[PDB]
Amino acid sequence: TFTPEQIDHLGITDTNHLSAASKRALKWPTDLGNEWFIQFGPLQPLKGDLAYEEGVVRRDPSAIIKENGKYYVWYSKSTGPTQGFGGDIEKDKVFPWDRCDIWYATSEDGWTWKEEGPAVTRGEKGAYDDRSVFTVEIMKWEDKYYLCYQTVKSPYNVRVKNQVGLAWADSPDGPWTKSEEPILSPADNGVWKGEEQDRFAVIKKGDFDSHKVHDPCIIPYKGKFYLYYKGEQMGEAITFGGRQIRHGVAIADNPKGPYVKSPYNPISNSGHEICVWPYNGGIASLITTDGPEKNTIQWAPDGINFEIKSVIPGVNAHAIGLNRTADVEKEPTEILRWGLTHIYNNGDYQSIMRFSSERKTR
Amino acid sequence: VTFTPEQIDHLGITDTNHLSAASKRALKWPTDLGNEWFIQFGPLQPLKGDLAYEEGVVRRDPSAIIKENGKYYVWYSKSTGPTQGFGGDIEKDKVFPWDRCDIWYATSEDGWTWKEEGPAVTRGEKGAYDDRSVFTVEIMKWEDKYYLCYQTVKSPYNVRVKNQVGLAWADSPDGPWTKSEEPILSPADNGVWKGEEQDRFAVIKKGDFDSHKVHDPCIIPYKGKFYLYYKGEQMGEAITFGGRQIRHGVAIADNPKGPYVKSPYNPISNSGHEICVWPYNGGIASLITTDGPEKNTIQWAPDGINFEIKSVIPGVNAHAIGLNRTADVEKEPTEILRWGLTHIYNNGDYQSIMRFSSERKT
Ligand SMILES: [Cl-]
Ligand SMILES: [Cl-]
Ligand SMILES: [Zn+2]
Ligand SMILES: [Zn+2]
């Protein structure tokens, strides 16, 4: 099937001799415009306490909200160099996001940021979040503020399964009350092989999130709470599209849970970081980094069934913290005009950075 | 919707009664496609000697590389001075960095330090089809004779000018070179401009994918004939959900000098930019970059016409690749891509040839 208009739009030279690629091009939706297509500007440094600082990791910025005349952002913060996993795991810092707490900063212009103080810290020895609390996002509901984040219980071994903690407050400045129990855990059905600390050696891989549940982000949606997350699997494979990473959602009736994973998981087949937002009654999601559908912006009318809306150039701003103060409903990608991100200055220390993006115009 | 037990497990799908839109897309992926076309490029590396960046000089769009007389040889577009663009006197200004070019060549023993030799093919006499610029060249060696094919513009270089492709040949890789008296390829003639203003977007009819331009000509001896792969630009080109509309075609001749006849199956890509193509396993492989819904893929056609996606790879930093035709291309699909030449934008006026690497992911 095809019209004359479609043939002309596609530049197809002979409808009696359609190449494989032209056949794929004729399956693209004809009513899908260019308004999901965007390009990022160069990453820009931040001023004040969010400038690079030797000896300190500040990374993985949350979404930004505005309260009290000020932008707020939450982020992972640790100090000291990273050794990695070849030595004493009880003693060393295995990743830059090991040994973290969650701190926060505010800004009147989104450029000069004042680090205010800790928001959420590691629990006492033996608790589920004693090793590191890190990789945070922010949700507001009915005048309360919620931070969901990754937790690790010591030791931070290659094979450890992280969980997700939740903390709440009555002001964006805290103080915050942590949940006594994690709100989300990886699947329980993988099975390791042997005793070596090797995340690739398994007897059974288990579900797509049998190892890790990452980048938790909660969107109040349809009167319920949709926690989108990234699974890593035990025995993760590399495919024609790279690392095999997929996204899930878990849904709660109330902010504090219980969050029950959707039978439709995984709700992506690709991606890495979680970057999602409600738009026109549904949920938009930027899929990046890994997988056959990396570098796409996707949209689900029901937060579950995502369709490709654009295929964009490789995205330079990783782990985006979305500008939630934007006029999100104006345009599918209005929320992405600016926001926060980070950059690997070096293997030990990273810093938060600001990005911009624009639609392309002829 | 079909599936097998083994697909469901490979894809990490949690429940076959509740398949997400994304999970259903993943079920269409070919189940016998391994991960051996998946690669990552390293960072661009500068060249030494005369192919170091040189303020005031453009050297760009490196041809594929061959080895003769003990040295690697490369041909490229070379011009001098700033670019004015299209807002001035077209007859006298330099409208693009690749305007006012001749084709030059360099040699090197290690592929790192390059000595610029001299002009290989220069603009023709005032009024000839190639008087304005000769640029964007490829090399092909056939039965002891060397062939360059390149783009040509006849002055004036207006927005709406249609470039063509010229061909030259020599008995030695140092030349002297003899040019074809006529061009060997031209853009489609079925587009219709709208208005008299120089505006490549204003059309009554767009015509074929290659109605405005026929770019990056590259000839591959194949099945005893000569397959000239090229990138079309289209009169009235749109920005779509995948960005600029850019597609590739092929034109086939019985003999190196032509006549080249366009395949009825054009276009044989639905995305891409500069041509980067190589023989492999009795078929043809193609690196699709920069633009379109299938950008950042490597594809392969068993017949040089019907290409299928073999990998989806991280955003490709090396455009306009000049492939290593000395590589043992049949050894594995991406063997040829271990190293080669490309270019980079130093600024809007000057570009430089660079060296790239890639590696299969572990
Ligand atoms: Cl983790
Ligand atoms: Cl041109
Ligand atoms: Zn994040
Ligand atoms: Zn080229």
Side-chain angles (χ1 to χ4, degrees), chain B residues 120-170:
Chain B
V121 177
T122 55
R123 292 159 274 178
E125 272 7 279
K126 180 162 165 166
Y129 78 98
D130 63 347
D131 66 359
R132 177 78 176 233
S133 201
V134 287
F135 56 119
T136 319
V137 64
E138 268 289 7
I139 175 77
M140 155 178 80
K141 181 175 185 171
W142 188 251
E143 290 175 355
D144 299 318
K145 290 204 160 153
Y146 296 90
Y147 292 87
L148 294 165
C149 53
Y150 46 86
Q151 300 171 198
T152 63
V153 169
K154 183 182 191 313
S155 195
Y157 201 146
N158 288 146
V159 173
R160 291 181 161 181
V161 81
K162 304 195 178 183
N163 77 284
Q164 296 176 289
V165 176
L167 180 66
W169 49 86

Short mmCIF file of all heavy atoms in Angstrom, two decimals, chain B residues 120-170:
data_model
loop_
_atom_site.label_atom_id
_atom_site.label_comp_id
_atom_site.label_asym_id
_atom_site.label_seq_id
_atom_site.Cartn_x
_atom_site.Cartn_y
_atom_site.Cartn_z
N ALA B 120 45.45 16.06 -7.80
CA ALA B 120 45.17 14.91 -8.66
C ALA B 120 44.19 15.31 -9.77
O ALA B 120 44.46 15.13 -10.93
CB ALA B 120 44.60 13.73 -7.82
N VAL B 121 43.03 15.89 -9.42
CA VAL B 121 42.06 16.32 -10.42
C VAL B 121 41.69 17.77 -10.10
O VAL B 121 41.39 18.04 -8.96
CB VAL B 121 40.79 15.43 -10.39
CG1 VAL B 121 39.75 15.93 -11.38
CG2 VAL B 121 41.13 13.99 -10.79
N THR B 122 41.74 18.69 -11.08
CA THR B 122 41.46 20.11 -10.81
C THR B 122 40.19 20.55 -11.60
O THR B 122 39.78 19.94 -12.60
CB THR B 122 42.66 21.03 -11.19
OG1 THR B 122 43.00 20.77 -12.55
CG2 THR B 122 43.93 20.71 -10.36
N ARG B 123 39.59 21.63 -11.14
CA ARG B 123 38.46 22.19 -11.84
C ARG B 123 38.77 22.38 -13.34
O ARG B 123 39.89 22.74 -13.69
CB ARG B 123 38.11 23.52 -11.22
CG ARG B 123 37.55 23.36 -9.83
CD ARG B 123 37.72 24.65 -9.12
NE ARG B 123 39.04 24.72 -8.52
CZ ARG B 123 39.47 25.77 -7.84
NH1 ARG B 123 38.71 26.86 -7.71
NH2 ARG B 123 40.66 25.72 -7.28
N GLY B 124 37.81 22.10 -14.20
CA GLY B 124 37.97 22.37 -15.63
C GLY B 124 37.86 23.87 -16.00
O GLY B 124 37.70 24.74 -15.12
N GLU B 125 38.00 24.14 -17.29
CA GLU B 125 37.97 25.47 -17.91
C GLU B 125 36.59 26.11 -17.68
O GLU B 125 35.59 25.39 -17.60
CB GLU B 125 38.15 25.35 -19.47
CG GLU B 125 39.59 25.35 -20.06
CD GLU B 125 40.66 25.30 -18.98
OE1 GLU B 125 40.98 26.37 -18.38
OE2 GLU B 125 41.15 24.17 -18.71
N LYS B 126 36.56 27.44 -17.60
CA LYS B 126 35.33 28.19 -17.51
C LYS B 126 34.27 27.68 -18.47
O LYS B 126 34.54 27.55 -19.64
CB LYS B 126 35.60 29.67 -17.71
CG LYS B 126 34.31 30.51 -17.62
CD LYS B 126 34.58 31.99 -17.37
CE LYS B 126 33.30 32.78 -17.68
NZ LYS B 126 33.43 34.13 -17.12
N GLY B 127 33.07 27.35 -17.96
CA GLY B 127 32.06 26.76 -18.83
C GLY B 127 31.92 25.24 -18.93
O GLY B 127 30.90 24.78 -19.39
N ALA B 128 32.95 24.47 -18.56
CA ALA B 128 32.86 23.02 -18.50
C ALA B 128 31.99 22.62 -17.27
O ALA B 128 31.84 23.41 -16.28
CB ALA B 128 34.29 22.35 -18.40
N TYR B 129 31.41 21.44 -17.39
CA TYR B 129 30.60 20.83 -16.30
C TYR B 129 31.23 20.78 -14.96
O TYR B 129 30.51 20.74 -13.96
CB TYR B 129 30.06 19.44 -16.67
CG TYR B 129 31.05 18.26 -16.57
CD1 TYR B 129 31.04 17.44 -15.42
CD2 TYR B 129 31.95 17.96 -17.61
CE1 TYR B 129 31.87 16.33 -15.30
CE2 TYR B 129 32.85 16.87 -17.48
CZ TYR B 129 32.77 16.06 -16.31
OH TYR B 129 33.57 15.01 -16.09
N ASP B 130 32.58 20.83 -14.90
CA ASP B 130 33.28 20.85 -13.63
C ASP B 130 34.15 22.09 -13.36
O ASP B 130 35.22 21.98 -12.68
CB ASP B 130 34.15 19.59 -13.54
CG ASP B 130 35.22 19.57 -14.62
OD1 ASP B 130 35.12 20.40 -15.57
OD2 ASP B 130 36.14 18.72 -14.55
N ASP B 131 33.73 23.27 -13.84
CA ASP B 131 34.56 24.46 -13.66
C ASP B 131 34.54 25.06 -12.25
O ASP B 131 35.40 25.87 -11.92
CB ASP B 131 34.25 25.53 -14.74
CG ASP B 131 32.81 26.12 -14.62
OD1 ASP B 131 32.02 25.69 -13.72
OD2 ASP B 131 32.47 26.99 -15.47
N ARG B 132 33.54 24.73 -11.44
CA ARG B 132 33.35 25.46 -10.18
C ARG B 132 34.04 24.81 -9.03
O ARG B 132 34.70 25.50 -8.26
CB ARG B 132 31.85 25.67 -9.84
CG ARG B 132 31.66 26.35 -8.50
CD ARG B 132 31.92 27.88 -8.64
NE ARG B 132 31.64 28.52 -7.36
CZ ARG B 132 30.83 29.56 -7.16
NH1 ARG B 132 30.30 30.23 -8.17
NH2 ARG B 132 30.68 29.99 -5.92
N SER B 133 33.89 23.49 -8.93
CA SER B 133 34.48 22.72 -7.85
C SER B 133 34.50 21.23 -8.22
O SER B 133 33.55 20.71 -8.92
CB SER B 133 33.73 22.92 -6.53
OG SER B 133 34.53 22.60 -5.44
N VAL B 134 35.60 20.55 -7.85
CA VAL B 134 35.66 19.09 -7.93
C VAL B 134 35.99 18.63 -6.50
O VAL B 134 36.94 19.13 -5.88
CB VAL B 134 36.72 18.56 -8.94
CG1 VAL B 134 36.23 18.78 -10.35
CG2 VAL B 134 38.05 19.26 -8.75
N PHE B 135 35.18 17.73 -5.96
CA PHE B 135 35.12 17.49 -4.53
C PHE B 135 34.44 16.17 -4.19
O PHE B 135 33.61 15.70 -4.95
CB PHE B 135 34.48 18.67 -3.80
CG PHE B 135 33.08 19.07 -4.27
CD1 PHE B 135 32.00 19.01 -3.39
CD2 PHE B 135 32.86 19.52 -5.55
CE1 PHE B 135 30.67 19.41 -3.79
CE2 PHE B 135 31.51 19.88 -5.96
CZ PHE B 135 30.45 19.81 -5.06
N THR B 136 34.78 15.63 -3.00
CA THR B 136 34.17 14.45 -2.41
C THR B 136 34.41 13.22 -3.26
O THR B 136 33.49 12.74 -3.95
CB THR B 136 32.62 14.64 -2.21
OG1 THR B 136 32.43 15.99 -1.74
CG2 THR B 136 32.05 13.52 -1.27
N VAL B 137 35.64 12.69 -3.18
CA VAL B 137 36.15 11.75 -4.15
C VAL B 137 36.25 10.34 -3.57
O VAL B 137 36.40 10.17 -2.35
CB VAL B 137 37.62 12.24 -4.61
CG1 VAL B 137 38.63 12.22 -3.48
CG2 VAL B 137 38.17 11.46 -5.79
N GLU B 138 36.23 9.32 -4.43
CA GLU B 138 36.48 7.94 -3.99
C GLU B 138 37.50 7.37 -5.01
O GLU B 138 37.60 7.83 -6.14
CB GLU B 138 35.24 7.05 -3.90
CG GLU B 138 34.57 7.07 -2.47
CD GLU B 138 35.44 6.34 -1.45
OE1 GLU B 138 36.61 5.93 -1.80
OE2 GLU B 138 34.97 6.18 -0.33
N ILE B 139 38.23 6.35 -4.58
CA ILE B 139 39.28 5.70 -5.40
C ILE B 139 38.79 4.27 -5.67
O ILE B 139 38.13 3.63 -4.83
CB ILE B 139 40.67 5.64 -4.69
CG1 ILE B 139 41.71 4.84 -5.53
CG2 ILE B 139 40.58 5.09 -3.25
CD1 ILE B 139 42.26 5.67 -6.73
N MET B 140 39.08 3.77 -6.85
CA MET B 140 38.80 2.36 -7.14
C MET B 140 39.96 1.84 -8.00
O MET B 140 40.41 2.54 -8.94
CB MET B 140 37.51 2.20 -7.88
CG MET B 140 37.63 0.90 -8.65
SD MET B 140 36.26 0.37 -9.59
CE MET B 140 36.38 1.34 -11.09
N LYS B 141 40.52 0.69 -7.65
CA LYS B 141 41.62 0.17 -8.44
C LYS B 141 41.01 -0.91 -9.35
O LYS B 141 40.29 -1.76 -8.86
CB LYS B 141 42.79 -0.39 -7.57
CG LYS B 141 43.97 -0.92 -8.46
CD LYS B 141 45.24 -1.38 -7.72
CE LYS B 141 46.30 -1.74 -8.78
NZ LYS B 141 47.62 -2.00 -8.15
N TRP B 142 41.26 -0.92 -10.67
CA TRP B 142 40.69 -2.04 -11.48
C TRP B 142 41.65 -2.44 -12.63
O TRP B 142 42.01 -1.58 -13.45
CB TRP B 142 39.31 -1.68 -12.11
CG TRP B 142 38.63 -2.90 -12.78
CD1 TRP B 142 38.46 -3.13 -14.15
CD2 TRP B 142 38.07 -4.05 -12.12
NE1 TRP B 142 37.83 -4.34 -14.35
CE2 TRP B 142 37.61 -4.93 -13.12
CE3 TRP B 142 37.96 -4.43 -10.76
CZ2 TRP B 142 37.00 -6.15 -12.80
CZ3 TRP B 142 37.37 -5.65 -10.45
CH2 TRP B 142 36.85 -6.49 -11.48
N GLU B 143 42.06 -3.71 -12.65
CA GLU B 143 43.00 -4.26 -13.66
C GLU B 143 44.14 -3.32 -13.99
O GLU B 143 44.25 -2.87 -15.12
CB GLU B 143 42.20 -4.59 -14.94
CG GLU B 143 41.30 -5.74 -14.71
CD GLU B 143 40.37 -6.07 -15.88
OE1 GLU B 143 40.36 -5.32 -16.87
OE2 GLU B 143 39.63 -7.08 -15.77
N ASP B 144 44.93 -2.93 -13.00
CA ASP B 144 46.06 -2.04 -13.25
C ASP B 144 45.81 -0.55 -13.52
O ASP B 144 46.75 0.17 -13.86
CB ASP B 144 46.93 -2.62 -14.38
CG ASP B 144 47.50 -4.00 -14.02
OD1 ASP B 144 47.93 -4.14 -12.87
OD2 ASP B 144 47.49 -4.94 -14.86
N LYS B 145 44.55 -0.08 -13.43
CA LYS B 145 44.25 1.30 -13.70
C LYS B 145 43.54 1.80 -12.45
O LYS B 145 42.97 1.01 -11.74
CB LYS B 145 43.36 1.46 -14.91
CG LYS B 145 44.10 1.13 -16.18
CD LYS B 145 43.51 1.79 -17.40
CE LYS B 145 44.63 1.79 -18.48
NZ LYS B 145 44.10 1.79 -19.88
N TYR B 146 43.66 3.09 -12.18
CA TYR B 146 43.10 3.69 -10.99
C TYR B 146 41.98 4.62 -11.48
O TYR B 146 42.16 5.29 -12.51
CB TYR B 146 44.18 4.49 -10.34
CG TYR B 146 45.31 3.58 -9.90
CD1 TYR B 146 46.37 3.32 -10.77
CD2 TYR B 146 45.27 2.97 -8.67
CE1 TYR B 146 47.46 2.49 -10.38
CE2 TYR B 146 46.37 2.13 -8.26
CZ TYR B 146 47.43 1.92 -9.15
OH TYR B 146 48.50 1.11 -8.83
N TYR B 147 40.88 4.70 -10.73
CA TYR B 147 39.75 5.52 -11.12
C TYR B 147 39.38 6.36 -9.90
O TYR B 147 39.20 5.79 -8.79
CB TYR B 147 38.55 4.62 -11.42
CG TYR B 147 38.76 3.80 -12.67
CD1 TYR B 147 39.40 2.56 -12.61
CD2 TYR B 147 38.45 4.32 -13.95
CE1 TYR B 147 39.68 1.81 -13.77
CE2 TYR B 147 38.69 3.54 -15.12
CZ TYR B 147 39.32 2.31 -15.01
OH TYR B 147 39.55 1.54 -16.13
N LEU B 148 39.21 7.68 -10.12
CA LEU B 148 38.61 8.55 -9.11
C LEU B 148 37.21 8.97 -9.59
O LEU B 148 37.04 9.39 -10.74
CB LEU B 148 39.46 9.81 -8.89
CG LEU B 148 40.89 9.61 -8.26
CD1 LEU B 148 41.73 10.80 -8.42
CD2 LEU B 148 40.98 9.12 -6.76
N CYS B 149 36.24 8.90 -8.71
CA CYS B 149 34.93 9.46 -9.05
C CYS B 149 34.62 10.44 -7.90
O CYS B 149 34.90 10.19 -6.68
CB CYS B 149 33.84 8.38 -9.10
SG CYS B 149 33.71 7.34 -7.62
N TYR B 150 34.01 11.57 -8.28
CA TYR B 150 33.92 12.74 -7.43
C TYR B 150 32.70 13.58 -7.88
O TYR B 150 32.16 13.40 -8.98
CB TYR B 150 35.22 13.56 -7.48
CG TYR B 150 35.67 13.74 -8.87
CD1 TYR B 150 35.17 14.81 -9.67
CD2 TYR B 150 36.59 12.80 -9.47
CE1 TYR B 150 35.58 14.94 -11.05
CE2 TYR B 150 36.97 12.92 -10.86
CZ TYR B 150 36.49 13.98 -11.62
OH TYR B 150 36.86 14.09 -12.96
N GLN B 151 32.31 14.51 -7.03
CA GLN B 151 31.22 15.43 -7.37
C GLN B 151 31.80 16.60 -8.17
O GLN B 151 32.96 17.02 -7.93
CB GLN B 151 30.57 15.96 -6.08
CG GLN B 151 29.95 14.83 -5.18
CD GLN B 151 29.47 15.28 -3.77
OE1 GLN B 151 29.29 14.44 -2.89
NE2 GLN B 151 29.31 16.62 -3.53
N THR B 152 30.97 17.17 -9.07
CA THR B 152 31.31 18.32 -9.89
C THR B 152 30.16 19.35 -9.83
O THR B 152 29.00 18.95 -9.77
CB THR B 152 31.48 17.90 -11.37
OG1 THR B 152 30.25 17.39 -11.89
CG2 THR B 152 32.55 16.78 -11.51
N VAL B 153 30.51 20.63 -9.76
CA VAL B 153 29.55 21.70 -9.94
C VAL B 153 30.02 22.57 -11.09
O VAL B 153 31.21 22.88 -11.22
CB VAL B 153 29.33 22.55 -8.63
CG1 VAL B 153 28.53 23.83 -8.95
CG2 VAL B 153 28.62 21.74 -7.53
N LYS B 154 29.07 22.95 -11.93
CA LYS B 154 29.26 23.96 -12.97
C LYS B 154 28.79 25.34 -12.48
O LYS B 154 27.66 25.44 -11.97
CB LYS B 154 28.42 23.58 -14.19
CG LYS B 154 28.60 24.53 -15.40
CD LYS B 154 27.64 24.03 -16.51
CE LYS B 154 27.87 24.69 -17.87
NZ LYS B 154 27.97 26.15 -17.63
N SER B 155 29.63 26.38 -12.65
CA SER B 155 29.32 27.66 -12.04
C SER B 155 28.08 28.24 -12.73
O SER B 155 27.97 28.03 -13.93
CB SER B 155 30.54 28.58 -12.17
OG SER B 155 30.45 29.68 -11.33
N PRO B 156 27.17 28.97 -11.98
CA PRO B 156 27.33 29.40 -10.57
C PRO B 156 26.84 28.36 -9.56
O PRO B 156 25.98 27.56 -9.88
CB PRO B 156 26.44 30.67 -10.50
CG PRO B 156 25.33 30.40 -11.52
CD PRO B 156 26.10 29.75 -12.65
N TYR B 157 27.43 28.35 -8.38
CA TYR B 157 27.07 27.42 -7.36
C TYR B 157 25.89 28.05 -6.56
O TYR B 157 26.05 28.35 -5.38
CB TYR B 157 28.28 27.18 -6.42
CG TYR B 157 28.27 25.87 -5.61
CD1 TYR B 157 29.47 25.21 -5.32
CD2 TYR B 157 27.08 25.30 -5.13
CE1 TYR B 157 29.50 24.04 -4.55
CE2 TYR B 157 27.09 24.12 -4.36
CZ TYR B 157 28.31 23.48 -4.08
OH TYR B 157 28.33 22.26 -3.35
N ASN B 158 24.73 28.24 -7.19
CA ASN B 158 23.47 28.63 -6.51
C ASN B 158 22.93 27.56 -5.59
O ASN B 158 23.30 26.39 -5.75
CB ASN B 158 22.37 28.88 -7.56
CG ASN B 158 22.60 30.11 -8.32
OD1 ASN B 158 22.28 30.20 -9.53
ND2 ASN B 158 23.17 31.13 -7.63
N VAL B 159 22.04 27.93 -4.65
CA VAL B 159 21.32 26.98 -3.82
C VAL B 159 20.74 25.81 -4.66
O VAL B 159 20.84 24.60 -4.29
CB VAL B 159 20.11 27.67 -3.04
CG1 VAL B 159 19.27 26.59 -2.30
CG2 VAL B 159 20.63 28.65 -2.05
N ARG B 160 20.15 26.15 -5.79
CA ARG B 160 19.41 25.18 -6.59
C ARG B 160 20.23 24.40 -7.58
O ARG B 160 19.71 23.44 -8.23
CB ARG B 160 18.25 25.87 -7.32
CG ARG B 160 17.20 26.29 -6.26
CD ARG B 160 15.98 26.96 -6.95
NE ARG B 160 14.82 26.94 -6.06
CZ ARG B 160 13.62 27.44 -6.39
NH1 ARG B 160 13.48 28.08 -7.54
NH2 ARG B 160 12.60 27.34 -5.53
N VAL B 161 21.50 24.72 -7.66
CA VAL B 161 22.38 23.98 -8.60
C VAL B 161 22.31 22.47 -8.32
O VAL B 161 22.24 22.03 -7.13
CB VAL B 161 23.85 24.53 -8.63
CG1 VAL B 161 24.69 24.00 -7.46
CG2 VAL B 161 24.59 24.26 -10.03
N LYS B 162 22.29 21.71 -9.40
CA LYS B 162 22.39 20.28 -9.32
C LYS B 162 23.85 19.89 -9.66
O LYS B 162 24.33 20.15 -10.78
CB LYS B 162 21.41 19.58 -10.28
CG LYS B 162 19.95 20.02 -10.04
CD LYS B 162 18.93 19.06 -10.71
CE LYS B 162 17.48 19.53 -10.39
NZ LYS B 162 16.71 18.42 -11.07
N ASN B 163 24.52 19.24 -8.71
CA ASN B 163 25.93 18.77 -8.95
C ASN B 163 25.85 17.51 -9.81
O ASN B 163 24.78 16.96 -9.95
CB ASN B 163 26.64 18.40 -7.62
CG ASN B 163 26.19 17.03 -7.09
OD1 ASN B 163 25.10 16.91 -6.54
ND2 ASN B 163 27.06 16.02 -7.23
N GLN B 164 26.98 17.04 -10.37
CA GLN B 164 26.93 15.80 -11.09
C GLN B 164 28.14 14.99 -10.55
O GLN B 164 28.81 15.42 -9.58
CB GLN B 164 27.06 16.09 -12.61
CG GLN B 164 25.86 16.91 -13.14
CD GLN B 164 26.07 17.26 -14.58
OE1 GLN B 164 26.92 18.07 -14.92
NE2 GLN B 164 25.32 16.64 -15.44
N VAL B 165 28.49 13.92 -11.24
CA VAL B 165 29.65 13.12 -10.83
C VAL B 165 30.52 12.94 -12.06
O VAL B 165 30.04 12.54 -13.18
CB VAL B 165 29.20 11.68 -10.38
CG1 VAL B 165 30.43 10.77 -10.05
CG2 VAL B 165 28.20 11.70 -9.14
N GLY B 166 31.79 13.12 -11.85
CA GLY B 166 32.74 13.02 -12.92
C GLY B 166 33.63 11.84 -12.58
O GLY B 166 33.57 11.29 -11.46
N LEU B 167 34.49 11.47 -13.51
CA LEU B 167 35.30 10.25 -13.29
C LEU B 167 36.61 10.57 -13.93
O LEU B 167 36.59 11.15 -15.03
CB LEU B 167 34.66 9.10 -14.10
CG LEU B 167 35.35 7.73 -14.04
CD1 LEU B 167 35.21 7.20 -12.60
CD2 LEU B 167 34.76 6.73 -15.00
N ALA B 168 37.74 10.13 -13.32
CA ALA B 168 39.03 10.29 -13.93
C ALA B 168 39.84 9.03 -13.75
O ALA B 168 39.62 8.30 -12.78
CB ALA B 168 39.83 11.48 -13.31
N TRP B 169 40.85 8.85 -14.59
CA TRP B 169 41.61 7.60 -14.49
C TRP B 169 43.07 7.77 -14.78
O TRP B 169 43.47 8.71 -15.44
CB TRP B 169 41.02 6.55 -15.49
CG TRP B 169 40.83 7.09 -16.87
CD1 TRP B 169 41.78 7.13 -17.92
CD2 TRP B 169 39.62 7.69 -17.41
NE1 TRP B 169 41.21 7.70 -19.03
CE2 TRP B 169 39.91 8.06 -18.76
CE3 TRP B 169 38.32 7.92 -16.88
CZ2 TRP B 169 38.93 8.64 -19.62
CZ3 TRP B 169 37.34 8.57 -17.73
CH2 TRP B 169 37.65 8.89 -19.08
N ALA B 170 43.88 6.85 -14.29
CA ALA B 170 45.33 6.96 -14.45
C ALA B 170 45.95 5.59 -14.46
O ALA B 170 45.32 4.59 -14.00
CB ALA B 170 45.93 7.80 -13.27
#
